[PDB]
Structures are given as structure tokens and as C-alpha cells.
Amino acid sequence: KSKDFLGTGWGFPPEFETSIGQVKTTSGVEDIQKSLEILFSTKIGERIMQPTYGCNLDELLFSPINRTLKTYVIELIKNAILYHEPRIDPEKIDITQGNEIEGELLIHLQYIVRATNSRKNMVYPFYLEEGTN
Amino acid sequence: PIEIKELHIKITVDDSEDKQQLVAQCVEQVLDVLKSQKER
Amino acid sequence: PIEIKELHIKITVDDSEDKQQLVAQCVEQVLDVLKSQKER
Amino acid sequence: PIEIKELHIKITVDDSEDKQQLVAQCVEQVLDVLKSQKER
Amino acid sequence: SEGKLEKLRIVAYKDSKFSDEVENGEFITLLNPEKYKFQYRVEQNEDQASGTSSAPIRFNKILPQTLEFDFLFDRTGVIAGYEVTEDGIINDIDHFKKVVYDYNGEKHKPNYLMITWGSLLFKGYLKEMDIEYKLFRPDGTPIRAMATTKIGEFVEEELRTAQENNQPDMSHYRTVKEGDTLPLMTYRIYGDSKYYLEVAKANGLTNFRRLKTGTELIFPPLQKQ
Amino acid sequence: SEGKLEKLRIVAYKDSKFSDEVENGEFITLLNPEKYKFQYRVEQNEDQASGTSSAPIRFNKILPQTLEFDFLFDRTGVIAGYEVTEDGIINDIDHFKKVVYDYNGEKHKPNYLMITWGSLLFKGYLKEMDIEYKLFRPDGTPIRAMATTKIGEFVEEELRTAQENNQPDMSHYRTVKEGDTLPLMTYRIYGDSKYYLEVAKANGLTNFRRLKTGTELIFPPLQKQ
Amino acid sequence: QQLAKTRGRIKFQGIPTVKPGVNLLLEGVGDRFNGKVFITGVNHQISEGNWTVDAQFGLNPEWFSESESNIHT
């Protein structure tokens, strides 16, 4: 019960059970992994009063793969995390092409979960006295 | 200053207006020190 | 000065603290002239 | 100034008298501002 | 596409988050610069008293960064891949100035710039420019010019606090390994060994002089007022 | 007339709109300069607090421009097309100074200048000049001289506000395309999504959560004081 | 008047404990001034990388009724 500032919440593809009248929830590291799935699945203007939430990775569809592109991809990913996921620090972004013919680009993101609580983390019994900005 | 009572007339020297800006800052900080001393 | 009543707050300009030392000397010599005039 | 009441003693620094002339101009303009405020 | 010679690009932007492009606001060069240069400055406070042999220099702040490079414009007709134009370099320089220099009445300022070439990616604003005109046609049309440029660096204030993840103010957790003691761990987290009885009370420990090697502890922050 | 070698000209003017010519106030050179040079400067405010890693940068001003070039006067007799004069270069330099330097008692100032050569067109004021005399006839008549010049830039204040078409203060209209929402369009026009209920009331919209894709909307300005 | 006998200012690296109404020990400034001094005022200045404090010692012999203006209508 030491790791209570990562928090608890709804699972992303919310599932409803009938063996008990409840919706499944996630916590800790599991919760972090689903947060990342949400962020990179939504476009910048799709939320109603949150006009700047999501990412622009679609800009790179139907384009050739080179050094300039790879640099741009890395920048897009790092900024989305700095703005929207306070609980982690990116470690490495590995961008490679696994198919000579099929139009595939493979991106592998590795990251580290923070041991100390961020000033941007809105978890209920903490942000009240620790959420300065 | 918030008062036109404390401005001085500007006279320059043809020695050939950097020195005009330094003297104007010194008059500003003296008159703020004199005003703060009359506070309770 | 022998009194903390006459010090001013220090504000510098990022124009790129030599000018801070010149203004502080001018406040010191003005307030000594004002004190000497009240002598008999 | 038209009065010897407002002159200060001259102390220089052996740092190796340009700065002496700048401080003397700032004392002159402050005391003219203080005199003009007592006019009606 | 390794074999492709990439060319340097500059794009103009409307907002401080760099997501809303200026329309027709992209410049692509025809000849790459030879080199480019960066500059980094850190400032310290160095006051000391008389009679002493050294000062413990203190951190003040980190100053903004700087990038510099040079460009060449030429439409004479000896460079493979390009054509000679009726008006020379007149439209190349006018489009370059519209992107990097000209005042924009929609935002009441010049444009935000993103500079990309290969590994390089830089955001900021223009500070300085010099353009010198070298060759001319007989009727006074220029066909060669040289430009020197200086760019400053821009960070938005919401992104500065996220990059400076500033952390006695926040909460912390550790796991006990064999060899740990409570006053040594308190010193590395708070800077002082004297808080060990407050850490033990917040965790419900009675025998704190022997810690078991699987326990997860919390370390609360210090109170502020 | 492509094959014609054009020569640089300078004309003097009386008014700040450049429509009333000074009589006998036009200079034409006999030899063109080799090159010319421009200068551009933008100033920013760079104050920051101690303890931080970057400063909050704010645009301040665009400073005036500068043009520089050099001239050569020679009446020795080896340049094709010209004649040797009885008095050398005396009348060439005296006419050049009357145009660009001399005080005009009708306007209580020196003249406004327009400089044209090919693609170049520049309006402003003389700041600096140096003239050096090189060769002489035995009786002391000069036949060769070199001149260096620096010109500043002039904009009239009525034309500055028309070039800075400065626009939450003015009115706006858009047409609805498919994919638009009312709070996203309000954010791009005002900078904040919270004004969407005032935009819907000014257009008579009841079902604003579904917009039809041919509607033209108005966006009124925000009120002052 | 006796507390106005010796007056002055001492500037040094800042700490949070010097407040009006405390004593400091002053050394190395000559026999005329060395000894224990009573603090009558403090100025804390924090900027550009450092925290310094100006400590004031001794009293001004003047009374409130003599030096302050606008006491009366």
C-alpha cells in the first residue's frame, strides 16, 4: 500500500461483469499501460473541452522512411508523453522497418515507472497538497 | 514615477545620451527611499 | 549607511550588475548630504 | 549648485576619476528636484 | 533512400505548441550549408569575503541557446538538377524573407520557426540577418547572393516545468534490501538523519532497529507551514 | 532592351508620400557599384528568474534597415562612351552632394531619397559619407575620387499600420465543412473554447451539437473596458 | 542614550535566526568596536543565486514624538 499515488481507475475497453454488478478496474502499472494505449489512439481535436490531447502520428502515413522522419517521430512521441503522462520517463525509442514490400513501420517504446510523485499527477489523496502545477 | 512633479529637463553634451539614462535611474531610486521612510 | 532603512531592492536586467554598483553609490552620497544640512 | 552646503568630499579608488564626475551629476539633479517641489 | 541527398527545410508556425502551420510558409534550400554551430552558457554567483582562499560557487541559471549558419543562392546555370529562371534569385529571396522575417498581422509578431535537416531539429526565432548581392545581369537582375543568420531558442513555459521534473516536497517509496538501516536511508532522502522516528511512526514500525528484507516503506514529505 | 546595361539612379523628393519631385534633383552614375548589402535586426526581451533552465521569450521590436555601397568617379579618358571634361569631376561631385546631402530651406531638412537599379527600390535618408580624392591635374584639378555611403530606411506612419494589418477585436465569418465542431472552431478564433454558447446565441442556433455542412456563421468580437 | 553609543551595520551570508532583539559577537574590527552587539534591525535579500542578510546594531537616540511627522491634525 506504498504505491498508492499511481492510483486506481476504469479499464480502457470497459468490461461489465454479471457475476457481480461491477465494471472492471485497473491499478498501478496496469493502469499506466492502458493510459499509453489511450493517448496514442486518439487525435488532437477529438476531445470536447480538451482541444489539445492526443497525437499526430498519422501525418507520416504514405511517406518514405529515412533519418529525417525518424527524428520527427521521436519528437512527436516524447512531447505527447511530457504533456499527458506524468507517471513515466521514456528510456528508448527504437524505429525499424521489418518488411521490404509491405508498408510497415515498427516502433518500440521502452520506459521507466517513476518512484516519486509528479506535480502533474491528479490522484485524489495526493494532489490536494502536492499538485502545484 | 507616478508623478510629473519629479521629472528633470534633459540636457545632452555633444562630446564627439547613454549617460542620460543612468542619471535618470538614480533620481528614481532616491525618491523611492525618501517616500518609504515616512511609512509607519 | 549605518541604517537598513535606506536600502533599495535589487533588480537587474538581462541585456546580453556593473550598473547596480554605480546606482547604489549615488543613493549613499545624496542621503549623506541631506543629513549634514540639519547640523547646526 | 549655488551653495557650498551641498558638496561632498572626494574619495577615489586605485583600481588599476571617471566615476567621480558621474556621481557628482546625480547629486546635483536630485537636489534640484527637491527644491522645485516646494514651489507654489 | 540512404543514397538521397537531403536538403534543409524551414517551416513557419502560428502557435507556441507548433501544431498550426502558416499557409504557404515552408522554405526549402537548393544548396546546403557547410557547417553549423551551437552555443551553451551557464551562469554562477561568485561573491566571496576578503581574507579567504576560495569561494563555493553557486548555481544561478542556464541562458538561452544559439544556432548559426550561412546560405548561398545561385541561378547561373552550372549546378546539375536546376534550371535558369527569367528573374534569377528574386523569388527565392522574397519567399525566404516572408517565412523567417516578415511581421504577421494575425498574431502581431513574426513567425515561429522549426528547422530540420537530418538529425537536427530546432525551434525558435530569428535575431539577425545580412544579405549581400554579388552578380548581376546587364539589366540589373541579381543571380547570386550570400546570407548569414542567427537563431534563438524558444521553450513554452508549460513544457519547461515538465522537463525540469522538480522533486522533502513529494512522496517516495522504497523496498528494504539486506544491509539497510533506517537512519542511513533517512539521510539520503531528506538530507538529515534526525527524521527516523517520524518515518517509523508513519509505517507502524516498533522494532525499527532490525528491518526485514522485503518490506515496502513510505516516506512522507515535510509539512510546509 | 535586355542587352542594355542599366545604370543606378537617385532622385530627391519633397514629401513623405514620394510624389513631388525636387527640381533638378536627379543623379545618374557613370559606373555601377560592384555589390550592395542589407542588414536586418529583431529585438527580444530575455529576462528570467534565478533557478530556472530557460527564459520566457517575448517579441519586442523590429529595428530599421540599412543599405551600403561604394562609388567611383573618374574622368581620365580610358572608359568607352564618355568624354574628358575641362574641369574633371568637379561638377559630378557637386551635383551628387546637392541631391543627397544639402539642407533644403523649403522643408527645413535634407531630401527624401529613392534609389533604383534593376530589381532594387529603396526609400530613406543619408546617414554617412566619406569622399577621398586620388588623382589630380598639375594645376590641382581632381580627376578621380571614391565615395562610401550608408542609407537608412523610411516608412510613413500611415503606411505602417496598413502593412501591419493588425486583427477578439474584429468580425469574422466561416462556412461549415463536414468534420467541424463548435467548441473546436471557437478555440482557433478566440484562443479559448468557453465562448461557444455566445457564438450559438448570436447565430440563432438551438441544435449546435450537430452543424449542417453549408451554414455560414458570424463570430463577433469581444467587448472592451 | 547609552544604547546609542555605538551604531552600525554588518553584512554576511544569510541564516533564518537573526531577528531584532538578539545578540551577536563581533570580532576583528578593532578594540574600539569589538564585543557583543544588540541587534535592532534585519534586512533579507534574495536574488541571483544567493541569500544575504544586513544586521543593524545600536539604537537611534531620537524619540517617536521628535522625528515622526503628521501625528497631529
Next chain:
Amino acid sequence: NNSGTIETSQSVDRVTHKILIDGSEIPGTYQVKSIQVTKEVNRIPTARLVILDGDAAERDFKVSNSDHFVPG
């Protein structure tokens, strides 16, 4: 104390501070340029804060418009 120095709890390499209004910290976007505090016998104590603000390109002052530095 004959140590020849001034006793502090930590190294003097890094100076830190906090500003609390009505019980909590002002957001870390505000840049405080300078802080002054004075106290003296027979006078009322005072303090001053210098905050960087204002932008000519926006035509406004965001900190001034906030409810943090309002009299009272």
C-alpha cells in the same frame, strides 16, 4: 563558534524558496526575480516580490489578472 564560517544545515550551493498564498503554493510557471524582507524595532514588518510579466504581442498581463496577488 570558532570555525571561521557561518553554520548552515546544508551546502550554500543552491538557494530555494516557496511562496504560499491562502495556504498553498503559487504555480511553478510564475518567475520570481527577487525577494526582499525587512524587520525593525518600533516599525511594522514588510516584504516585496518582483515577478516577471506582460507581453506586448498579446496586449496583456496574465499574473496581474490572476487571483493570487489581490489585496487582502
